[PDB]
Amino acid sequence: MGLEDKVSKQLESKGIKFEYEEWKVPYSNNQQNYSSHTYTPDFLLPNGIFVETKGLWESDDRKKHLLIREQHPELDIRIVFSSSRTKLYKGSPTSYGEFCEKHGIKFADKLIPAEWIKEPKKEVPFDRLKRK
Amino acid sequence: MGLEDKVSKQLESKGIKFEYEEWKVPYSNNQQNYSSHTYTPDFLLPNGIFVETKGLWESDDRKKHLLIREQHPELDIRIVFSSSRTKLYKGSPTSYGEFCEKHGIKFADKLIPAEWIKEPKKEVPFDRLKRK
Amino acid sequence: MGLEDKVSKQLESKGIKFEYEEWKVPYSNNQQNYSSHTYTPDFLLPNGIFVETKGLWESDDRKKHLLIREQHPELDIRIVFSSSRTKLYKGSPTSYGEFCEKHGIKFADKLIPAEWIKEPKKEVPFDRLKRK
Amino acid sequence: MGLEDKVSKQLESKGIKFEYEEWKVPYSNNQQNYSSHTYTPDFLLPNGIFVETKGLWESDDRKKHLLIREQHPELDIRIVFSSSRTKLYKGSPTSYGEFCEKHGIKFADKLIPAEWIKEPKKEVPFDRLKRK
Amino acid sequence: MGLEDKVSKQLESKGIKFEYEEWKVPYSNNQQNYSSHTYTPDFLLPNGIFVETKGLWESDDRKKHLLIREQHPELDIRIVFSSSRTKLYKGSPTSYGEFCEKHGIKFADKLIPAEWIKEPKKEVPFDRLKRK
Amino acid sequence: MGLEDKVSKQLESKGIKFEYEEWKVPYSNNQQNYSSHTYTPDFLLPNGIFVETKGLWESDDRKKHLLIREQHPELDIRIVFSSSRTKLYKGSPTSYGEFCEKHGIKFADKLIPAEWIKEPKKEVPFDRLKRK
Amino acid sequence: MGLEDKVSKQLESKGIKFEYEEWKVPYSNNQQNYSSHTYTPDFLLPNGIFVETKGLWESDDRKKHLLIREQHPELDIRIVFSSSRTKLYKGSPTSYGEFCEKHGIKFADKLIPAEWIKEPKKEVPFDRLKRK
Amino acid sequence: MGLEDKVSKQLESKGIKFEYEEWKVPYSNNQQNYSSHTYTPDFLLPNGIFVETKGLWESDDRKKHLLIREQHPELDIRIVFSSSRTKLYKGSPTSYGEFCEKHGIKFADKLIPAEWIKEPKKEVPFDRLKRK
Amino acid sequence: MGLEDKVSKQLESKGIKFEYEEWKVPYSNNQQNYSSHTYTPDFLLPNGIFVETKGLWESDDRKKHLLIREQHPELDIRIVFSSSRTKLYKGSPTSYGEFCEKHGIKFADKLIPAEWIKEPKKEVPFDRLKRK
Amino acid sequence: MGLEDKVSKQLESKGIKFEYEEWKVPYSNNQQNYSSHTYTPDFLLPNGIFVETKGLWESDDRKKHLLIREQHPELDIRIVFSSSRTKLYKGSPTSYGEFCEKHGIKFADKLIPAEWIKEPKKEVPFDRLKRK
């Protein structure tokens, strides 16, 4: 390279004992791959609401939930738990419920609340969805 | 499913007509992949300063220089441009130099400032480094 | 309620003439009201980069962009301004470009940079998109 | 468009095989979608102070409050918590009260302070309100 | 006052020549009176949109507009100007238009844009309004 | 009206059926009235320190003390409480002292700290002050 | 003191060659003087508005203005610049106008707006003010 | 000024009965003074660290430490209290320890941690200091 | 130098009794050493996760962790606390758990979650890592 | 530790082939060193102010001024350049003047402002200084 070379020459002219393309700096490049996936709620109420029954709620499941929320604010996806009191990880002070309150997720225990069922209808962008 | 069953039965008991796992919600998983690579500075001065000559500076090149600054603070890496007055893109008001200034990247034009070569020697962690 | 009755009790005893749940405060919210829309970028490069040529870029087209970004992080969308030098509005110290830089939106001026065109190809989830 | 045609021109000449306005990005917004609602505080004192006795105060009843505030700055609404000591959610360093203080919401515990009752009377725009 | 007196005595006991309720500190107390008022748009389009014709646009008029926006986000009130180019105050660099863009107000010159008229209908809370 | 007329005629020309100034939008004008008053500290020590005794500390009292701190920084005003351990409201975790600490209000209990009385004399702007 | 002795024996018990209360670290403690001062606005219209004409307006005069603003919120003081277009200082993307806009300072260009002069009179706390 | 003249002239032609420089606004600007004060750590460890033991930690001394950190960043001064638990003041919801963490001050309880004792030496500018 | 001479004559031309290049203001310039270091995680599961057990965990160990995090983003390092319930430090409203939650650090209590152990393996950059 | 032991035990019973303290993570913590350096203002005005004239203002010296401000807040050091317009560096969109305003440094062009010359005296700690 002209510039690269002109520079080495500059160093050589001053009798500078430098090192040429000898050392390498190890670093890790974080690529962000976006893999596209699908998530199917368990029940779709007539009023447009979506309900997901969940017994055990893994970290994957949670994150994925949150992703679905960020990317699709037009959807109402709520979770019915067997025990909203269950703790995220054994020994942890945080439950499925709390974590739900935190990121504002509507949830309930054992059965879909009558309130939810009786809620005023809202359009669901089916065209945006993919049926099974 | 257990809890699932119960829910669906609840729904049927109230005669609510619902859709059972009919639709899938598409979403993309923002995966952060971390691949790893090496960066080889052009010259290593006797005082410990690493210098990279650079005619044309690309986008990748920039990000890359930035990852390294974060992942390797101990290392002193500087750029020497054919022209720091060059723009990142056609019509772009922002220039190489402005950019490096904006990120704390010491740089210069055409040749290595004698001042650089005169700065007091500093240690270099050859251990953390690999060779060619 | 218990707290409610306690509170109404203290007041009653104290002889505080007061009104219980008599008035309703007319208020409004847009919480669960997301109307589905579409945004057709101007160009789609093979490597997958979307380009949106914009003359005037008002404060609303800005909101829409940040919006579409959050909802579609899997897509690469940049802007070719007629002038990134333009201020958010006459009377602002900030320009279109500076906005884009702060918000990490890739942009160019008048024409689509060659660098962009020569970037390494990445996938595009056409399913998640509707074709005119 | 001119900019649009210029951009498509450069690309055409350069031989860049590209797609012009072919795909639409399904996105969503709640911009102009405000559903009208009502909030009935629990008590209305003669001096005009509204009091809302609240046991559990979740992260949503919070949003509604700040909301109703902005929209009705002319009204005086305070909260009698069963416990302002409660944290926003188990796992938070912040409590109900501290939230209220930061956001400038007047609050008491268990009972309506006498001080409140004895404050100097101020008008109330009953027209702007619907009575149950 | 017991405490007040106990303190003076304390000062007297130490033969401290202090001054008693002699000086006053002048300060101004800013009361926030909320006067309730009304604002009548000039035209109400069938699609729920409100339009206000405006020739001259005083500071009062502006502020009031903004108030109406903050307090009633459920209403669509737009302004048709004779000259959106007119400057706020003579000599000023800011126009009715710019000020409009700034606070995101939809405006137009001389006539209601056909686009506006053709916009998709939206409910108007008449019950919330007061007719003339 | 002129521009008004034109608009309405435009509307009629397209046969659009509109409502002409039919409804008024109610809103409250947040007026900031600035009344002015005086504050009379209980004692003025020979060193320039103003002291206010205070058994029970009300809400008005607090705000008032705060206006003065802003409007009159030069003046050194301190409170002496019968009990700084007292709460602002029943059940309130927050106490007088905590409050003054939170706002930089030097205070003390029962009696004037001899340390105060011992602090070096500072000027007092009697000019800016009024007498009784 | 106890802690000192417990700490010095600990050191000594380990044979730590330390230095005991040997060196004095110098520094400078600061207090704040308050010089009473006065600012004479240029004009005082019949409605109360105080107008101050201004050509140059450096950071120094600006600060003093904001200061006066804090201490005297009850006063309406506007500025008539020879040119609000003049930047705060050479190089700044900001001007006197924008600065004032951001700080709530009501400003104008060349002459006192007819609008100001018409605004409905409001009382002035001449008590708080000193006459020339 | 020319601006002053012009402004009044326009005021005159319109016949506005204004007041020219007839009133002064009393405000108080505050100057800052400095005291040549001196501090004195308790112990001076071989590795440079200055350890100061502290029983009751007055907010005053708390200020000094803040100053010294700043004024002498070349010095390492840590604190060892009889209790890093003690609260800043009566009823204080904050402990000395919290204080030090908020400002980056290294502390310890009862005796000097061995980790500190073994910490690597670092020059101490005895010239910038004074001997007892 | 020119400016110096122009400035000194100006002073002299006014008869200003000033002092010329007489005093030297002392200060301390700082550089930053970089000591290469290493941290040995406690366990390394088959899927890549590095687990580090922890009882006490003071600000010092916390910082080091965050540091390691910055420099080595490609590494999954979690912590198993004896009790995440333990506050960062006495008095803090925060605990090890919440701290980690806020900082993205994946933590657990008492033992290594079965979930972690099941997570799908991911590559480790052993190049970047040194073996014991 | 007991925690370490327990964690591995559970790992063992489940039969997880893990690696105990088998890998070190190379990271680099950086220490901070200080140089006893000395600065020297150009002129020392009677009122205390130290005026330093400056032609080309290197970013290096820019750092020093920052340090000195901090390390010696008891001193007033201002700058007079041959141009407060000059840019920090080649292609720099920032002027020396801007620099000083961002850090609160008082500057002037060509000669020392008379305002400075007439500014009220303030002690100068000649003891904390050294003579040329």
**Closest CB from E22, E27, E45 relative to F16:** E45
SS3 content of chain C, % helix, strand, coil (to 5): 30, 25, 45
**Closest CB from A34, A72, A122 relative to C32:** A122
SS3 content of chain F, % helix, strand, coil (to 5): 30, 25, 40
Q: Do chains A and E touch (3 or more CB pairs under 8 A)?
A: no
| Residue G9 CA neighbour count, 13 Å, CB half | 6
**Do the Cβ atoms of B78 and B48 come closer than 8 Å?**
no
Which residue, among H19, F128, H24, has the nearest Cα to G49 in the 3D structure? H19
D109 close contact with F: CB closer than 8 A: yes
J112 close contact with I: CB closer than 8 A: yes
DSSP state of F130: E
| Residue F120 CA neighbour count, 13 Å, CB half | 2
Resolution of the experimental structure, in angstroms: 3.0
C-alpha H94/C-alpha H88 separation (Å) is 6
Which residue, among E82, E80, E89, has the nearest Cα to E55 in the 3D structure? E82
**Do the Cβ atoms of D78 and D132 come closer than 8 Å?**
no
Rg of chain G taking only CA atoms, in angstroms: 27
Distance from CA of A35 to the nearest CA of I (A): 16
Which residue, among G63, F77, F43, has the nearest Cα to H30 in the 3D structure? G63
Q: Are strands H43-44 and G19-20 parallel, antiparallel or unpaired?
A: antiparallel
| Residue C106 CA neighbour count, 13 Å, CB half | 14
The experimental technique behind this entry is X-ray
D34 close contact with C: CB closer than 8 A: yes
**Closest CB from D4, D37, D110 relative to C53:** D4
Chains that touch B (3 or more CB pairs under 8 A): A, C, I, J
**Do the Cβ atoms of G132 and E113 come closer than 8 Å?**
no
**Do the Cβ atoms of D67 and C29 come closer than 8 Å?**
yes
Distance from CA of I124 to the nearest CA of B (A): 10
Residues G11, G14, G15, G17, CA torsion sign: negative
C-alpha C34/C-alpha D35 separation (Å) is 11
C-alpha I74/C-alpha I77 separation (Å) is 10
C-alpha J109/C-alpha J102 separation (Å) is 17
In this complex, do D108 and F91 lie within 8 Å of one another by their Cβ atoms? yes
| Residue F97 CA neighbour count, 13 Å, CB half | 19
DSSP state of B16: -
Q: Which residue has the tokens 């050479």?
A: G90
Which residue, among B39, B43, B5, has the nearest Cα to B128 in the 3D structure? B39
Distance from CA of D94 to the nearest CA of I (A): 8
Q: Are strands I50-54 and I43-44 parallel, antiparallel or unpaired?
A: antiparallel
Both structure tokens of D17: 């095989």
Q: Do chains I and J touch (3 or more CB pairs under 8 A)?
A: yes
**Reduced to 3 states, what is the DSSP secondary structure of residue E9?**
helix
C-alpha I58/C-alpha I70 separation (Å) is 19
C-alpha D46/C-alpha D76 separation (Å) is 12
A55 close contact with I: CB closer than 8 A: no
Measured CA angle at G106 (ends G100, G112), to 5 deg? 125
**Reduced to 3 states, what is the DSSP secondary structure of residue B103?**
helix
Burial of F19 (0-12, 13-18, 19+ CB in 10 A): middle
Q: What are the residues whose beta carbons fall under 8 Å from the beta carbon of B91, sequence distance 6 or more?
A: C84, C108, C109, C110, C111
**Reduced to 3 states, what is the DSSP secondary structure of residue D101?**
helix
**Closest CB from I28, I89, I91 relative to H125:** I28
Which residue, among A85, A59, A84, A76, has the nearest Cα to A125 in the 3D structure? A76
Q: Are strands J107-109 and J77-81 parallel, antiparallel or unpaired?
A: parallel
Both structure tokens of A73: 């604010």
J28 close contact with B: CB closer than 8 A: yes
Q: Return the beta strands (E) in chain E as ranges.
A: 19-20, 23-31, 34-39, 43-44, 50-54, 77-81, 107-109, 130-131
Rg of chain H taking only CA atoms, in angstroms: 27
**Closest CB from D59, D90, D91 relative to A104:** D59
Task: Give me the count of residues in chain B.
Answer: 132
Q: Compute φ and ψ for H103, nearest 5 degrees.
A: -115, 10
Distance from CA of D111 to the nearest CA of C (A): 5
B27, B60, B88, B89, best to mutate vs chain C, most C CBs in 10 Å: B89
> In chain H, what residues touch F84 (CB-CB under 8 Å)?
90-91
Q: Does an H or E element contain J81, and which? A: strand J77-81
Which residue, among H74, H61, H60, H55, has the nearest Cα to H127 in the 3D structure? H74
Residue type, C128: R
The total of other beta-carbon atoms located within 10 Å of residue D98's CB is 18
Q: Where are the alpha helices (DSSP H) in chain F?
A: 2-13, 59-71, 96-103, 114-118
**Do the Cβ atoms of B34 and A29 come closer than 8 Å?**
yes
Q: What are the residues whose beta carbons fall under 8 Å from the beta carbon of J102, sequence distance 6 or more?
A: none
> In chain G, what residues touch F74 (CB-CB under 8 Å)?
34, 36
Q: Return the beta strands (E) in A2-85 as ranges.
A: 19-20, 23-31, 34-39, 43-44, 50-54, 77-81
Which residue, among I127, A25, A27, has the nearest Cα to B42 in the 3D structure? A25
DSSP state of H55: S
| Count of H-run helices and E-run strands, chain A | 4, 8
Phi-psi domain of J8 (left: phi exceeds 0; alpha: psi -120 through 50; beta: other): alpha
Residues F3, F8, F10, F13, CA torsion sign: negative
Q: Does an H or E element contain G107, and which? A: strand G107-109
E130 close contact with G: CB closer than 8 A: no
C-alpha H47/C-alpha F130 separation (Å) is 60
C-alpha I55/C-alpha I45 separation (Å) is 20
Q: Do chains A and G touch (3 or more CB pairs under 8 A)?
A: no
Q: Which domains does chain F carry?
A: 1-132 (3.40.91.30)
F74, F119, F126, best to mutate vs chain G, most G CBs in 10 Å: F74
Residue type, E72: H
Distances (CA, A) of I11 to J106, J112, J130: 19, 8, 24
Residues H106, H110, H114, H119, CA torsion sign: positive
In this complex, do D110 and F93 lie within 8 Å of one another by their Cβ atoms? no
Distances (CA, A) of D16 to B60, C20, C77, D23, I41: 21, 72, 18, 18, 51
Both structure tokens of F41: 């500290």
What is the rounded (10 degree) CA torsion for F62, F64, F67, F72? -110
**Do the Cβ atoms of B75 and B52 come closer than 8 Å?**
no
C-alpha F11/C-alpha E129 separation (Å) is 23
Chain B residue closest to A117 (CA)?
Answer: B16
Distance from CA of I12 to the nearest CA of J (A): 12
Task: Give me the count of residues in chain G.
Answer: 132
> In chain I, what residues touch D89 (CB-CB under 8 Å)?
none
Both structure tokens of H1: 């000024």
Q: Does an H or E element contain I9, and which? A: helix I2-14
Chain F residue closest to H25 (CA)?
Answer: F128
D71 close contact with E: CB closer than 8 A: yes
Chain C residue closest to A125 (CA)?
Answer: C36
What is the rounded (10 degree) CA torsion for J94, J97, J103, J104? -160
Chain breaks in chain F (C to N over 2.5 A) after: none
C-alpha F6/C-alpha E110 separation (Å) is 8
Q: What are the residues whose beta carbons fall under 8 Å from the beta carbon of C28, sequence distance 6 or more?
A: D34, D35, D36, D37, D71, E72, E73, E74, E125
Both structure tokens of A37: 């996936």
Q: Which residue has the tokens 């402990």?
A: H95
Which residues is A87 bridged to in the sheet?
A: A95
In this complex, do H84 and I90 lie within 8 Å of one another by their Cβ atoms? yes
Q: Provide the CA A96 distance to its chain's centre, in angstroms.
A: 16
Contacts from C61-68 at CB under 8 Å and sequence distance 24+? C62/C99, C64/C39, C64/D29, C65/C105, C66/C103, C67/D27, C67/D29, C68/C39, C68/D25, C68/D27
Chain breaks in chain G (C to N over 2.5 A) after: none
Residues I115, I117, I118, I121, CA torsion sign: positive
Q: Compute φ and ψ for A58, nearest 5 degrees.
A: -65, 165
In this complex, do F32 and E30 lie within 8 Å of one another by their Cβ atoms? yes
What is the rounded (10 degree) CA torsion for G76, G77, G79, G80? 70
C-alpha J82/C-alpha J90 separation (Å) is 17
Q: Compute φ and ψ for D39, nearest 5 degrees.
A: -130, 115
**Do the Cβ atoms of F25 and C28 come closer than 8 Å?**
no
Both structure tokens of B90: 């056609």
C-alpha J90/C-alpha C57 separation (Å) is 31
Residue type, E31: Q
Both structure tokens of I54: 């922890």
Q: Are strands H130-131 and G23-39 parallel, antiparallel or unpaired?
A: antiparallel
Q: Does an H or E element contain D43, and which? A: strand D43-44
Which residue, among E113, E96, E117, has the nearest Cα to E44 in the 3D structure? E117
Q: What are the residues whose beta carbons fall under 8 Å from the beta carbon of I9, sequence distance 6 or more?
A: none
**Do the Cβ atoms of E14 and E20 come closer than 8 Å?**
no
C and E: number of Cβ contacts within 8 A: 23
C-alpha E20/C-alpha F42 separation (Å) is 6
Q: What are the residues whose beta carbons fall under 8 Å from the beta carbon of H122, sequence distance 6 or more?
A: H47, H48, H76, J31, J33
Measured CA angle at B16 (ends B10, B18), to 5 deg? 95
A38, A71, A119, best to mutate vs chain C, most C CBs in 10 Å: A71
In this complex, do I28 and H74 lie within 8 Å of one another by their Cβ atoms? yes
C-alpha B66/C-alpha B103 separation (Å) is 8
Which residue, among E108, B1, E51, has the nearest Cα to A56 in the 3D structure? B1
D127 close contact with F: CB closer than 8 A: yes
C71 close contact with G: CB closer than 8 A: no
Burial of G118 (0-12, 13-18, 19+ CB in 10 A): exposed
> In chain I, what residues touch A26 (CB-CB under 8 Å)?
127-128
Q: What are the residues whose beta carbons fall under 8 Å from the beta carbon of F45, sequence distance 6 or more?
A: E11, E16, E18, F51, F112, F116, F117
Q: Compute φ and ψ for J116, nearest 5 degrees.
A: -65, -45
**Reduced to 3 states, what is the DSSP secondary structure of residue C81?**
strand
Chain G residue closest to C90 (CA)?
Answer: G98
**Reduced to 3 states, what is the DSSP secondary structure of residue G1?**
coil
Q: Where are the alpha helices (DSSP H) in D72-112?
A: 96-102
Q: Do chains J and D touch (3 or more CB pairs under 8 A)?
A: no
**Do the Cβ atoms of J49 and J116 come closer than 8 Å?**
yes
Which residues is J23 bridged to in the sheet?
A: I131
Q: Which residue has the tokens 């009235």?
A: F33
Q: Give Dmax (Cα) for chain A.
A: 86
Q: Does an H or E element contain G27, and which? A: strand G23-39
Both structure tokens of D114: 């006498």
